[PDB]
Design a protein around this nucleic acid. Structure first.
Lengths: 108, 117, 121, 160, 49, 199, 51, 422
RNA sequence: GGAUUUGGUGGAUUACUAGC
């Protein structure tokens, strides 16, 4: 073999990408509206989805089951964007910020 | 894992194994024995088939049913796969996978496959 | 780029490209010097736009000379790539032209822009 | 415009996107960001990449490590022919993903610093639909892509 | 500190190079004749750079 | 399927140790059954996976695909010591009595270990054992004089005589559980089977 | 090549005709000549007949 | 097989049997000077008379041709027929013909060669029997008026099927089809032998090498996308360069250098191959021009390396060879020039190599670092090793000065290396 | 990544007792 083992190399190949599909996150609990925003937890293995369904659905992405941790419906609060937040100083602090075409924003 | 008699005579056998293989074995002469192909026919609708780009051999055959009343006209075989929600067809004359896939439609694994005469 | 004159300020360069991109959407836009040169020959061109950064600039310096002869407004924009993307193409453009079309849905804006261009001239 | 929020948000630098028109989005990559947040102060790092989207689909790349009023872009990606709706860099900044919600499968992955688009993936059979959201895991090389149909499809980058 | 910081530092340090496509050395046949080979190698490097 | 790949109660039944996948990395956690712990050992390698988990009377022995065995203290949240066999084959089963520790590799190779001494005592392979998904060591006195093995059938082996003693007809599918309920009576179960055989 | 040559000819000419401070060197013509020769070389290189 | 198919094989075997008048017209009609009608009108002796003079002119240009007057261009060769000889006699005839084509390879532009080769075509029918040998000599003349004539009078072997279109065609073979013939794996094996013979015989000349390297490079470009076939191009094409580097001719050495550089960029490869590559590059490096080309090459081969040890020190034997063939002052001059290529990781491997093996050369490392901006990891690793030197080696004015240089530039990183190490 | 066409070879198209 005259091709270097890419396992040792941390620089990915320029033209060839090694990718494999896994189970979909929303399969466990489908969303009734589009997925306007997505966010990965800084440390925990969690995914958040939000959209015009006004629902903040959070999934535990393991790649095989991807079950739903919890859901939060915000009536009259369309979800155009949502994001996780962790205080840089206080790692214990975790908060979620979501907003839409409204003159208000929600923190959880 | 499973075996079947292909014809009213003792000419050809149908066998399946945990190596994800289905074989035609002939008692009459070894050279006649052959392996059926798993090259999928092109779908009638015209869309792309949904499957992994890397070709992988179909899962083990839990159950199988054979008929020869209609050999040569279309698919004459059904097989059931482990942890899998639909049944694949085979054509003994073509020795190739069929163009029909049969689903339980109730979110259940296939457990029994049978044929009308 | 002393030859390029008059050169639109930053303010005017927004509107000129704004009409250009829409005129592209309405198929009211000709892109390339010779095509712009061709339009002037028929006198169907409302006015001409030019990129000052072209090198050698002289290849487009013949367009002004027609426009004065035909009394057509013309102007320079600083960036060619902006002109090309405004035209709606994957390549840089040095010159562009707009038809005379009094039935166009974008009519009033086109008269508006050249009123500044003639003012800039 | 560049504002320093630690000095009352005063402008500190001004420059123009070369060939910029109908700009849609901007993003930075190669360091800490919303997609790649830090856990402590020492983890704070500067981003070495910047991409500028546009309605036409052009994405101009700029090398942040290497200041002028007019900076030349390292590359001008043009594979997508529609407005760029999602721009995101890998946590390490080695990959840039550009997507557009206008047309189906309008998703491209760009190798960095080569600025070369990968060819093997995405394919015609790759299910993406109306791409509308993209996310990169902070670690593990996982990719989540949402669509107008409400499906979030997951992929794993075997390199990571 | 951590080793992965050093690794990511190594990643960001690496810089782009001009990749070779199919139509990069085709013109070489054009000027193929009565040329000093040192100049040929230098010009190959130019195209590579 | 379930998120928990593998789980095991302690012998007292007061603590449950479980392993789950976070992103592409497995994490091992322990909870008090009688009554939250946010501390999990995180496998730094995606390739690394746990194949076997065994409580010790207060460490848990975790066999990996890598071919080495891990003695984990829950409080320190760190692996105290690493048992590594010469080969790299994944460990298929693990069992313990006091200092005694026996494991099996995908090469169908036996190995004996001492917890107190931190040493590999012996390793050998018995013919007529092509596959071995289960190791169970029979509770006879205070010493291991015999061992029970099953892959699809079940076989009994002597350590000193290093050959099979008796073979039982097992399940068609691979054996999944091989617990010994009492003397001369051990239960057997197999993957995808509704039936448990008392032998 | 007639179309390509004519396009470059206009480019060279508009430089020749109107350039206020043209150097009598033909550099714009030379570089344009290089491009068309490259255009010719690839064009003639193509073979319609199957090999 | 059908009777015709077996019969067709017989026809090919006895192509030159010269059976009847009709066949003999075809065999004699083939010519490289005269048209068919005149060619049929001529006899062997008239052809020999011209060729004998043609060889004499060649002998004046190049002495080695005079040898063939004794064996191929002898007066008694007129009566020699190949069909009547035995296999032992034929191979000896073939071997002599093989050598003549090699020397004639570089003088095809000269008219006398074309006349001299006419005797070989007419007398021994090299065009039908030694078909492959003749083409392999004249590939680089593909655009030449001589080459098209070769095609008209000859039957292409299986491997040269790409040229079948242009046989008896107004247009000469184009640049692209040369690549297509070279893309075939088997032809490279065939040409591998041909270039191998020339290297042994010191018969290679610039038009060949520059034509080869320039065809060989294009095979990479066409085949860049697919990795697997590039992998098949490694066991053969790298072997080509090793032979070229072995040639004492500087021409061959640089020809190999163009080959190595493009492979590495096209296909990343083990450091072991790279370390072996430079060692062979340096083993037979004598010419100044190759010395300039080699140093550029050696940098590039490391530029492609993207694995652990990318900047690790050269081995001891490897370090010794490089300095002997490239003095430190040479690389400083290399580092002075503004248009220098990227060699940050090669120099980094060198600075560490100096650090491990030479105590005198430390103060040059200072100058080396000033000339080239090293990437911050390359700086970090250089800092890392230099820390060990202080603990092991005695403190020196240069050694502390090297520290002081790092004190001046990026103070914080120096502490970080000290913090991690001591 | 998908689709259309096609060249070649291999095994059968007769019931398996060794070669020359």
């Amino acid at each position: 073999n005259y091709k270097d083992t890419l396992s040792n190399s941390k620089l990915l190949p320029p033209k060839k990408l090694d990718i494999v599909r896994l189970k979909d996150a929303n399969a466990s609990h489908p969303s009734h509206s589009a997925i306007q925003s997505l966010s990965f937890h800084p440390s925990k293995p969690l995914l958040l989805t939000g959209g015009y369904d006004k629902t903040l659905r959070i999934y535990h992405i393991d790649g095989k089951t991807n079950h739903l941790v919890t859901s939060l419906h915000l009536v009259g609060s369309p979800i155009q964007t949502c994001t996780f937040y962790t205080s840089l100083s206080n790692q214990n602090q975790q908060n979620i910020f979501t907003a839409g075409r409204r003159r208000y924003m929600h923190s959880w | 894992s499973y075996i079947a008699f292909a014809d009213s005579q003792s000419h050809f056998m149908l066998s399946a194994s945990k190596d994800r293989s289905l074989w035609s074995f002939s008692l009459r002469k070894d050279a006649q024995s052959q392996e059926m192909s798993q090259r999928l026919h092109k779908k009638q609708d015209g869309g792309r088939v949904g499957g992994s780009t890397i070709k992988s051999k179909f899962p083990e055959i839990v159950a199988l049913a054979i008929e020869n009343a209609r050999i040569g006209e279309w698919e004459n075989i059904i097989t059931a796969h482990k942890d899998e929600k639909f049944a694949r067809t085979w054509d003994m004359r073509n020795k190739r996978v069929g163009r029909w896939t049969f689903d339980t439609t109730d979110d259940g694994f296939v457990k029994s496959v049978a044929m009308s005469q | 780029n002393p030859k390029a004159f008059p050169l639109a300020d930053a303010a005017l360069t927004q509107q000129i490209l704004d009409v250009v991109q829409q005129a592209a959407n309405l198929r009211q836009l000709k892109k390339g010097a010779n095509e712009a040169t061709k339009t002037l020959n028929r006198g169907i061109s409302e006015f001409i736009i030019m990129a000052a950064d072209c090198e050698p600039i002289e290849i487009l310096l013949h367009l002004p000379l027609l426009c004065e002869d035909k009394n057509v407004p013309y102007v320079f924009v600083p960036s060619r790539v902006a002109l090309g993307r405004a035209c709606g193409v994957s390549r840089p453009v040095i010159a562009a032209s707009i038809t005379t079309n009094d039935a166009s849905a974008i009519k009033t804006q086109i008269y508006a822009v050249k009123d500044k261009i003639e003012t800039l001239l | 415009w560049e504002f320093d929020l630690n000095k009352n948000g005063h402008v500190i630098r001004r420059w123009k996107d070369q060939g910029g028109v109908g700009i849609t989005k901007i993003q930075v990559g190669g360091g800490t960001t919303t997609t790649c947040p830090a856990l402590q102060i020492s983890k704070i790092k500067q981003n070495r990449w910047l991409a500028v989207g546009s309605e036409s689909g052009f994405v101009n790349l700029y090398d942040r490590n290497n200041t002028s009023s007019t900076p030349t872009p390292v590359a001008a990606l043009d594979q997508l022919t529609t407005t760029i709706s999602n721009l995101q860099f890998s946590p390490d900044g080695q990959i840039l993903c550009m997507a557009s919600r206008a047309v189906k499968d309008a998703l491209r992955l760009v190798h960095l610093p080569s600025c070369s688009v990968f060819s093997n993936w995405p394919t015609s059979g790759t299910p993406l639909g109306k791409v509308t959201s993209v996310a990169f895991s902070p670690s593990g090389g996982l990719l989540a892509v949402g669509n107008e149909q409400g499906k979030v499809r997951l992929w794993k980058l075997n390199h990571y | 500190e951590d080793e992965e910081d050093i690794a990511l530092e190594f990643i960001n340090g690496e810089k782009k190079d001009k990749l070779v496509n199919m139509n990069s050395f085709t013109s070489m046949f054009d000027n193929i004749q009565n040329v000093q080979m040192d100049t040929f190698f230098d010009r190959v490097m130019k195209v590579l750079t | 399927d379930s998120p928990v790949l593998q789980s095991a109660y302690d012998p007292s039944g007061q603590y449950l140790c479980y392993v789950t996948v976070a992103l592409d990395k497995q994490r091992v956690g322990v909870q008090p059954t009688q009554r939250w712990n946010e501390n999990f050992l995180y496998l730094e390698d995606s390739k690394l996976k746990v194949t076997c988990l065994k409580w010790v009377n207060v460490a848990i022995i975790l066999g990996m695909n890598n071919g080495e065995i891990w003695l984990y203290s829950v409080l320190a949240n760190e692996v105290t010591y690493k048992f590594t066999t010469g080969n790299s084959y994944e460990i298929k089963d693990i069992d313990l009595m006091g200092n005694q520790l026996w494991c099996i590799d995908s090469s169908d190779a036996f190995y004996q270990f001492d917890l107190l001494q931190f040493k590999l005592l012996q390793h050998f392979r018995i013919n007529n054992c092509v596959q071995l998904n289960k190791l169970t060591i029979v509770p006879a006195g205070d010493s291991v004089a015999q061992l029970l093995v099953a892959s699809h059938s079940i076989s009994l082996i002597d350590i000193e005589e290093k050959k099979v003693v008796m073979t039982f007809p097992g399940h068609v599918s691979p054996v999944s559980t091989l617990q010994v309920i009492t003397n001369e009576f051990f239960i057997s179960g197999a993957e995808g089977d509704r039936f448990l055989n008392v032998y | 090549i007639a179309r390509v040559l004519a396009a470059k000819a206009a480019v060279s000419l508009r430089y020749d005709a109107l350039a206020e401070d043209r150097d009598d060197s033909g550099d714009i013509g030379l570089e344009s000549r290089a491009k068309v020769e490259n255009r010719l070389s690839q064009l003639e290189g193509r073979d319609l007949r199957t090999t | 097989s059908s009777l015709s198919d077996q019969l067709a094989q017989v026809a090919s075997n006895n192509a030159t049997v010269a059976l009847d008048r009709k066949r003999r017209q075809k065999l004699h009609s083939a010519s490289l000077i005269y048209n068919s009608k005149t060619a049929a009108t001529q006899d062997y002796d008239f052809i020999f008379e011209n060729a004998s003079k043609a060889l004499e002119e060649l002998s004046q240009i190049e002495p080695k041709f005079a040898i063939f007057s004794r064996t191929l261009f002898s007066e008694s060769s007129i009566s020699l027929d190949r069909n009547v000889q035995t296999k032992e006699e034929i191979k000896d005839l073939d071997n002599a013909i093989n050598a003549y084509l090699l020397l004639a390879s570089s003088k095809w532009y000269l008219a006398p060669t074309l006349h001299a080769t006419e005797w070989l075509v007419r007398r021994f029918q090299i065009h039908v029997k030694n078909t492959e040998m003749l083409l392999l000599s004249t590939l680089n003349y593909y655009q030449t008026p001589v080459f098209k004539r070769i095609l008209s009078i000859i039957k292409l072997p299986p491997l040269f099927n790409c040229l079948s279109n242009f046989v008896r065609s107004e247009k000469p073979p184009t640049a692209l089809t040369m690549i297509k013939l070279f893309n075939d794996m088997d032809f490279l094996k065939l040409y591998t032998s041909y270039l191998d013979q020339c290297i042994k015989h010191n018969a290679t000349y610039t038009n060949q090498l520059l034509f080869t390297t320039c065809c060989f490079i294009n095979v990479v470009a066409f085949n860049s996308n697919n990795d697997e076939k590039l992998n098949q191009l490694v066991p053969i094409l790298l072997e080509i360069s090793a032979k070229l580097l072995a040639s004492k001719s500087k021409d061959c050495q640089i020809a190999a250098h163009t080959i190595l550089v493009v492979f590495a960029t096209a296909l990343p490869l083990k450091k072991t191959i790279i370390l072996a590559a430079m060692e062979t590059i340096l083993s037979n490096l004598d010419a100044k021009e190759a010395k300039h080309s080699a140093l550029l090459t050696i940098c590039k081969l490391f530029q492609t390396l993207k694995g652990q040890g990318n900047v690790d020190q050269l081995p001891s034997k490897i370090f010794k060879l490089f300095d002997s063939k490239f003095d430190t002052v040479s690389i400083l001059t290399f580092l002075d020039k503004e248009d220098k290529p990227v060699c940050d990781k090669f120099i980094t491997s060198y600075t560490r190599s100096i650090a491990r093996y030479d105590r005198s050369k430390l103060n040059i490392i200072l100058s080396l670092l000033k000339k080239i901006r090293l990437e911050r990891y390359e700086v970090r690793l250089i800092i890392t090793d230099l820390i060990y030197l202080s603990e092991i080696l005695e403190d020196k004015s240069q050694l502390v000065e090297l520290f002081e240089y790092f004190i001046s530039i990026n103070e914080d990183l120096v502490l970080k290396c000290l913090k991690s190490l001591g």
